Amino acid sequence: IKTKNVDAVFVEKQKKILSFFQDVSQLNTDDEYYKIGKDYDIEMNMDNYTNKKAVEEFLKMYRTGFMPKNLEFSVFYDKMRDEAIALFHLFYYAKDFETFYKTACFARVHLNQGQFLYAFYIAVIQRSDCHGFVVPAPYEVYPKMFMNMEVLQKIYVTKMQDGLINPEAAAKYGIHKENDYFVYKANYSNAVLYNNEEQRLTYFTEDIGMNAYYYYFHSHLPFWWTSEKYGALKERRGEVYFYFYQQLLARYYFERLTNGLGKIPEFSWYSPIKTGYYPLMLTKFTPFAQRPDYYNLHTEENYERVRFLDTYEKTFVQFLQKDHFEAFGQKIDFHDPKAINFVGNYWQDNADLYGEEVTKDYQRSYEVFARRVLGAAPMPFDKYTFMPSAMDFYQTSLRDPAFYQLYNRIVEYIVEFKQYLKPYTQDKLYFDGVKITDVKVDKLTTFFENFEFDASNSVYFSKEEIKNNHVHDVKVRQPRLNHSPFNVNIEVDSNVASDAVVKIFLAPKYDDNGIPLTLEDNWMKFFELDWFTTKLTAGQNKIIRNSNEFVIFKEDSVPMTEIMKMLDEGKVPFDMSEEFCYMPKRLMLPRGTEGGFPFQLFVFVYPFDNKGKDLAPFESFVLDNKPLGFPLDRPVVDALFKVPNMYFKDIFIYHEGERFPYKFNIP
Amino acid sequence: IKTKNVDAVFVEKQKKILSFFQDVSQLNTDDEYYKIGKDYDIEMNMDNYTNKKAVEEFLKMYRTGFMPKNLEFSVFYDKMRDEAIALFHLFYYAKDFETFYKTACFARVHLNQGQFLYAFYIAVIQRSDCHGFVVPAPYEVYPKMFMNMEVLQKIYVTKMQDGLINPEAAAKYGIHKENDYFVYKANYSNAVLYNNEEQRLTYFTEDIGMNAYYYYFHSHLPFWWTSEKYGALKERRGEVYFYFYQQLLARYYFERLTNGLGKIPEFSWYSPIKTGYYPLMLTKFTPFAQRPDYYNLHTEENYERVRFLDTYEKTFVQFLQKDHFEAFGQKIDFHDPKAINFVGNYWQDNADLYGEEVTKDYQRSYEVFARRVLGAAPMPFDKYTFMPSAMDFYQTSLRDPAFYQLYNRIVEYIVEFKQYLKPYTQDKLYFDGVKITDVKVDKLTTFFENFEFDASNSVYFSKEEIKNNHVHDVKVRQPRLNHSPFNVNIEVDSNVASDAVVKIFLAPKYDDNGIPLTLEDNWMKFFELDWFTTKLTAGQNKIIRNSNEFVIFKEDSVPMTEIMKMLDEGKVPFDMSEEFCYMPKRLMLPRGTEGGFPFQLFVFVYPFDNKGKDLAPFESFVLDNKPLGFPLDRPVVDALFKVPNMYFKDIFIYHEGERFPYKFNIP
Numbered sequence A, B: 001i002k003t004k005n006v007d008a009v010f011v012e013k014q015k016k017i018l019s020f021f022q023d024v025s026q027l028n029t030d031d032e033y034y035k036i037g038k039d040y041d042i043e044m045n046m047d048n049y050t051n052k053k054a055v056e057e058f059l060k061m062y063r064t065g066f067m068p069k070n071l072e073f074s075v076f077y078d079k080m081r082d083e084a085i086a087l088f089h090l091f092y093y094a095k096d097f098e099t100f101y102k103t104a105c106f107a108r109v110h111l112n113q114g115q116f117l118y119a120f121y122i123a124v125i126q127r128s129d130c131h132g133f134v135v136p137a138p139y140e141v142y143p144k145m146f147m148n149m150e151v152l153q154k155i156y157v158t159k160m161q162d163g164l165i166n167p168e169a170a171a172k173y174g175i176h177k178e179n180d181y182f183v184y185k186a187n188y189s190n191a192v193l194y195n196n197e198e199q200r201l202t203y204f205t206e207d208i209g210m211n212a213y214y215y216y217f218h219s220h221l222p223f224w225w226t227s228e229k230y231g232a233l234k235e236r237r238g239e240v241y242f243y244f245y246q247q248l249l250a251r252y253y254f255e256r257l258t259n260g261l262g263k264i265p266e267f268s269w270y271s272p273i274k275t276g277y278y279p280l281m282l283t284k285f286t287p288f289a290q291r292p293d294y295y296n297l298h299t300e301e302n303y304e305r306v307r308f309l310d311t312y313e314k315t316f317v318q319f320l321q322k323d324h325f326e327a328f329g330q331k332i333d334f335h336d337p338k339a340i341n342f343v344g345n346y347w348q349d350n351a352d353l354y355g356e357e358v359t360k361d362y363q364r365s366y367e368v369f370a371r372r373v374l375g376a377a378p379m380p381f382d383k384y385t386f387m388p389s390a391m392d393f394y395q396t397s398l399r400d401p402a403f404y405q406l407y408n409r410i411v412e413y414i415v416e417f418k419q420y421l422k423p424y425t426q427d428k429l430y431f432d433g434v435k436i437t438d439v440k441v442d443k444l445t446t447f448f449e450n451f452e453f454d455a456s457n458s459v460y461f462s463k464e465e466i467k468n469n470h471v472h473d474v475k476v477r478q479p480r481l482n483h484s485p486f487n488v489n490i491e492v493d494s495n496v497a498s499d500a501v502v503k504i505f506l507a508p509k510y511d512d513n514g515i516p517l518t519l520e521d522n523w524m525k526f527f528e529l530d531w532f533t534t535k536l537t538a539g540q541n542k543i544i545r546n547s548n549e550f551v552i553f554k555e556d557s558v559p560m561t562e563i564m565k566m567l568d569e570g571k572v573p574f575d576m577s578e579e580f581c582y583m584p585k586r587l588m589l590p591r592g593t594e595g596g597f598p599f600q601l602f603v604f605v606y607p608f609d610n611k612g613k614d615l616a617p618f619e620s621f622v623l624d625n626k627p628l629g630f631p632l633d634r635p636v637v638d639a640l641f642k643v644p645n646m647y648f649k650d651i652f653i654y655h656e657g658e659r660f661p662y663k664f665n666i667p
C-alpha cells in the first residue's frame, strides 16, 4: 500500500540483498552467489575494507574455525557471538556495495546459516550505503521460530509425500493446497495446552509481529555494539532501553488486564519460580527446554550463576544507597535525569557502558545469565552445543512469561532510580492560555483476522528440484489481533497563535479490583500512542488525529514475493524501508470485550519551539529535548500535575466477532 | 639414601633441636631441657633478642596467661593463634642458637605442648641460622593426627597391659611385637565405614604423606606471617597460593577419575551440603565433629557466619565486574597477570594483603570461617575449648571431602579472574627451529606397599619408666601408594645450538564420559611434573629424564631414630634438609587400573636465557621470569596454542599387585 520509488541501480542492489533470504538452509551450486562465494579471497581484497584490524581479526578467527553448519546459533554464548561480531565487522567495513555483496556470498557459502543471517540482517540495517534498503520480515527468514512444532511437522510430512495423499483427510488437519501453495492453519499453543493462566495471553505472546518486533529492536541496536554511529543518540542510549521495556511491559499489562490476570509476578533467584513455560518448538538436534511450574532456580548447577546475578543487583542497590558515586570510569549523580543513560546501560551491560566499540567476554552480562537460568535448560554440552530455550533468541523471547518477569524486575529497579528525580512542577507543565476543553474518540473495537505468511524457507528441496526451480511453497495462516481505525478529536482553546506538541497516551482505568488508577503510582502504566505538532490559532481549535497517522506504529511487512513484484515496478514499501523497528499497528489496542473494557486516554498539549521555519518529523523531535515519554518519564504528584492543557477521557475497548482464535481454525 | 655431610657443631645443634620432638606429651625432670627451662628468665635476657617490642609483647601476654596444658591447640582461633604467634616471635628474634634453644626449653616446660610444637616447628623452618637444619616428619611429631581411633586405642590398651596378653589373640587384630617395637597394622577408614562414594579415595585423602605435605606447606609460609623474609618472592605470594591449590586439586581430580568419581561438587552456604565426613579420630576431651550427609549450612548458629562469607565472595564478584579498582590501599587491574598476587592474597586474607608483618583479629579470615562452618562442630564453649574438626588442623585437612570442595570454590573464582588475561600468542610460545619429533615413556605402574612410621610420641610413660629409659616403642604400618620409576625420552630436532627449558605436565585424556579433553577448558587440570634445562645441539637430540630426577617431588622422610644414627656418622638426609615442602614422590601418579587407565603427557620445550655462565637449579628458575605453571597459567585457545616445540603423548597408568589396601592388613 504505502510505497516509494527507486532507480534501477537501487533495484539491482535490493534484489542482490534479498537473494540471501531466499532458500536459506540449502545451497544452489548453479546460482551466482555460489560461484562468487566459493573462490572469493578476502586476503587478496584486504585494501577493500575500511578497517584492516577488523579483517585481520576475522581471518585469524576464521582459520581457527567457526561454528559448524548443522548446529543452532545463538548470540547469547561467547564464542558464537564473537564469530558473529567478527563476521559483522567484515560486512560493515567493506569499502562499497560490491565488496559487501562478495563478502556475503562467501559467508553464505562457507558458514553456519544462522550465524550468517544474524550477521547479515544487522549489517544491512547498520551500513550507511544500505540505509533506504529493505529486509524481509523475520518470520519469513526464520519461519521455524515463529510456529509450533505441530505445524512444522505437517509441513515436513507434506513435502516428504510430494503432496497431499487424500485432500479430504488433510482438510481435517487444517491443510489444503491453494494454487501452488500448501496452506497450514495454525492454532496458538493453548489450543493444545493450558498448563497455567498465562496461556490466556498466547495470541499476544506468540504473535509473529510482537516477536519480530523484538527481533528488530535488537537488530537496530545490539547490546554488544556501540551506538557511536548514531552520534547524539549515544548519550541517550540508556533512555531508549528503559523506554522500550517500560512501554512494551505497559502494553503487556493491558493484555493481562483484559484477561483478568493482574500484575506481573515477582521471583527470587533463591526460590522456586511459580510460572512454567512449555515451548512447543524444536531444532535439528533437540527440543527447546521446558520449565515446569515451581521450578527451583537454586540448584547445584546454578549456584555460581545465582551468586553473580545476586551481586549484579546488590551492586545497583548500593548505587541507590549513595546518590552520587563513581562507576565504570564515570561520575554518576542520581538527581540528574540524564543518569538514566548510565542506568540503562548498566542493566543491559552494553558496549556504551564501558567506552568500547564491542563488549568483551570478561564483561559478563546480567541479561545473558538471567536468561540462561530462567531458561531452565541443562548445562550446554560444549560451546556450540546447548539446549535452546525461548530466551536464547530474540525471535522467541516474548513467548515466555519469564521474559516479562525478568524485564519487569529490571525496569522496577530503574524506577527505584526514577524516584530521585524532582517531580515536574506546575509551571514546567503549564501551557499558558491554552486549554483542552474536550476530547472525543471514535469507536474502539478489536477483532481477529486470518493472516498468512510465507513459510517456505523451512522446506528442504532436491538437487534435481533446485535446478528445475520446482515450486513447493508454504503458507501458514492464523488469526491475529487487529482493530478498526479511529479518530481522536481534540478541542482546545488557544488564547493566541502558538505552535504546539500534542501527545497521546493510553492507560488503564481501574486495577483488577475496581480501584481507580492514580497517576502517583500508575504513571509507568501509561503507553504512548502519538507524538505530533500543530499550529494553534486564537479562539477555538480542533485537531482530528487518526490512528493510521499515529507515529509510533507500523503496517505489516510485505512478503518477499510481493516486494519482489514491486521492484519490477520501480517501487518499494515505505513502512519497511524506514519504519521497521516500530510496533505493528494492529496490536496497538489490547483485546477488548464484547461489552467494552474500560481504559482511559491522556491527551497533553504543550509548547513547541517555533523553528521560525517549516518542520519535518524526525528532527522536529530532536529540536525539543524533552525526555522520552514526557511528561510521564518520572513520578508524578497528582495535585502538582494536572493542568488545563491536559485531558483524561474515559474510553471503552470493545471486541467484535469471534472471541477465540481457534474458532477460525476449525475444520 | 640421599645424604649430606655436616660438622660436629651442626650435629650438636641438630640433636638439641630434635630433643623437643622426642617425648612430647610428658616432661622428663631429670633431662637437661627441664633444668634450663624451669628457671630461665626472659626479662634478664632481653638484650639477647633482635626485637625488644616482640619480647615485651610476649612477656605481657604470657603474664596475662596462655592456653592450659590439657587442651587442644588450633591456629584457627584468635587468642590461641596470637599466643602462638608471640611465642614464635620470641623464637625468631632470639639473638643466636643458644638463646633460641634456651627459649624453647622454657616453652616446652611452661606451655601447652601443641602450641609449643606449632611455634617451634615453624621457628626452625623460618630462622636463617637454622636453614640447613632438619625437622622430623609431622606424622612422627603428631602421630595421633595421622591414625584412626581404632589404632590409637589399641596402642593405649597394649601399654596399659604392659604388653601383649595372648600374642596369638592379638595377631587377629593386626598387633604383634617385633623386637622391642609393638606393631599395629592400620586400615583406611572405609575398611570400617563406607558412608558415601568419597570413601573410595581414602588411600589418597588419608595418606600420611599428603597430609604431612599440607602441614609443611603451611609451616613454610603461614597465612598470618608476611613473606618479607623471602624478598622478591613476596611479590609472587598470591601466585604461589593459587598454584599450590590448583596443582593439588588437579592431582586430586586424577584420583577421582580413576575411581569413577568425576568433578568436584559445588555447594551453597544457603543450602544443605550433600557430602558428609565422619572423622574417626579423637582428643583427650572430645571426639572430632561429624558432618552428616545433607547437613544444612544455614541454621541459626551460622546465620552471621554465612553473611560474612557471602559478602566476602560478593566483594570479589564486584572486583570482577570492574576490571580496575582500588582495594586494600592498592590499585588493581585485572588485565595485569601480576594481579594474581593480590587475588591470591585476597582469598587467603594473609599478612601481605595489608602491608603488615602479622594479621590482626579484626582482619577476619574467609578461610577460617569457611572451615569453621563446613566443619559442622557446635559453637566453641570458650576460646580454648572447641569441638575439633578435620579443618582445625593442617595435619587433617585433606581428610575431608569438604576441604577440596572449599578450595575448589576459591580456585574457580581465581580462574574467573584468569579470564581477563590475554591468551599466549603463537609467537610468544614458538621455539624457532626446534621441534619435538617424538616422546616415548616407560611403563607407568602403580602399586601399594606397606610403610611403617614411629608412632611412639602417642604413648604415656611412668616416672619410674622415664628415668629407666625403659622402651615401649610403637610402629604403625599401612599400605601406601607408590609407583615404579620410569623414563621419559624426548626426541627433539634443534636447528641450532641453543639452551632450552623442558617442562613436563600430566593431564587427563577424557572426562568420565569419554569426551576427549580440550585445552581450552581443561588447562587447569594439568599437573606439572618437571622443570629442567638442557643444552640442545644442532640436528637430532634426545633427552632422557627419569622420574627420580623430577624436581617437583621428594623422597619419604627418614624416621628420627634413623636421622639420629646418621648424625653419629656426620651425615644428614638431603631431601629432608632442603626439599621437605614438596609432594612425596610415591604419590605422583594416581592409582592406575590393571588394564591401563588413560592419561596424557604434555612435553613443552622453550628458549632458556643463556646465562653466558654455568647454571644451578634454584636461581635458574628465577633468571627466567615465566609465571608458575607456564605455559598453562592462563586460558589457552587450542588453535592459537599448539606449536612444534609442544608434544602430547597418550599414556596409560597400570596398577600391579593387590588392588585394595585392606588385603595387606588381613590376619
Ligand code: NA
Residues within 6 Å of the ligand: A264, A265, A266, A267, A404, A405, A406, A408, A409
Ligand atoms: Na518480576
Ligand code: NA
Residues within 6 Å of the ligand: B264, B265, B266, B267, B404, B405, B406, B408, B409
Ligand atoms: Na566446590
